[PDB]
């Protein structure tokens, strides 16, 4: 598979999200670029419908793992780029402890020269003055490692991991992610050995932006697969 060859330079990114959480509807559009050689993403997200009714951090994981940096001696475990350009479907349920849950379905694929992430999100059973609908989460994102396993019986990968959102009162809101990815096209895809992605995020604001928005810098790097015997 020559999908990896599509990520050797800097690749423009488009993210479009339609959301509906407890009947609060919203849209987000993001634009930026990805640099898979460094595992680097830089995007600016706009809530195009006005006010985002959930905290920006709760959408970070939903708003392009094909840009993770896989070390050379792990390239054969990079499912995400192998599925390109025909792309993959990314599906999650994100269960917020003692609160509601998101269900997401995304298509990540190339459209022209641009990597596009198109997401449908439905949120259900949230408390209107909980941490999510009540906007009680701090504007940041803790670094986290997410374990990846192959899903042979689906030709894809799966992953479950916990995100820990800092609450404004010092407590922590748990967001349990269950994720599954499957290719869109029928080409050959890499089924990795078990490994993890290591992720860091920096969230900020654009001074000259009055719209509700999030400026995001993200690094994703693959790890967890051992070495030792490499002399070609």
Phi, psi of 230 (to 5 degrees): -105, 105
Resolution in A: 2.0
List Cα–Cα distances, 103 to 39, 97, 119, 121, in angstroms: 26, 15, 10, 6
Cβ-in-10-Å burial (0-12, 13-18, 19+) of 127 comes to: middle
Residue 188 near residue 136, CB atoms below 8 Å? no
User: Which CATH superfamily, name and number, covers 10-223?
Assistant: Green fluorescent protein (2.40.155.10)
Phi, psi of 218 (to 5 degrees): -135, 140
R_g (Cα) of the chain, nearest Å: 17
Percentage helix, strand, coil for the chain under 3-state DSSP, each rounded to 5: 10, 50, 40
SS3 call for 175: strand
Experimental method: X-ray
Q: Measuring CA to CA, which residue among 140, 139, 112 is closest to residue 14? A: 112
* Buried b / exposed e along 52-85 (16+ C-beta atoms within 10 A): bbbbbbbbbbbbbbbbbbbeeebeebbbbbbbbb
Residues 6+ apart with CB under 8 A from 122: 19, 20, 21, 102, 103, 104
């Amino acid at each position: 598979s020559k999908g990896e060859e599509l990520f050797t330079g800097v690749v423009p990114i488009l993210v479009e999200l339609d959301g509906d959480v407890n009947g609060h509807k919203f849209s987000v559009r993001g634009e930026g670029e990805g640099d898979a050689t460094n595992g680097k993403l830089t995007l600016k997200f706009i809530c195009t419908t006005g006010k985002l009714p959930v905290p920006w951090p709760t959408l970070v994981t939903t708003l392009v793992l094909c840009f993770a940096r896989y070390p050379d001696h792990m390239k054969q475990h990079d499912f995400f780029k192998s599925a390109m350009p025909e792309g993959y479907v990314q599906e999650r349920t994100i269960s917020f402890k003692d609160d509601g849950y998101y269900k997401t379905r995304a298509e990540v694929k190339f459209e022209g020269d641009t990597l596009v992430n198109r997401i449908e999100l439905k949120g259900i059973d949230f408390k209107e003055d909980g941490n999510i609908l009540g906007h009680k989460l701090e504007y940041n994102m803790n670094s986290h490692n997410a374990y990846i396993t192959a899903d042979k019986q689906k030709n894809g990968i799966k992953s479950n991991f916990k995100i820990r959102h800092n609450v404004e009162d010092g407590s922590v809101q748990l967001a349990d992610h269950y994720q599954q990815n499957t290719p869109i096209g029928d080409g050959p895809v890499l089924l990795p050995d078990n490994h993890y992605l290591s992720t860091q995020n920096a969230l900020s604001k654009d001074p000259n932006e009055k719209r509700d928005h999030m400026v995001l810098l993200e690094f994703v790097t693959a790890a967890g697969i051992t070495l030792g015997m490499d002399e070609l």
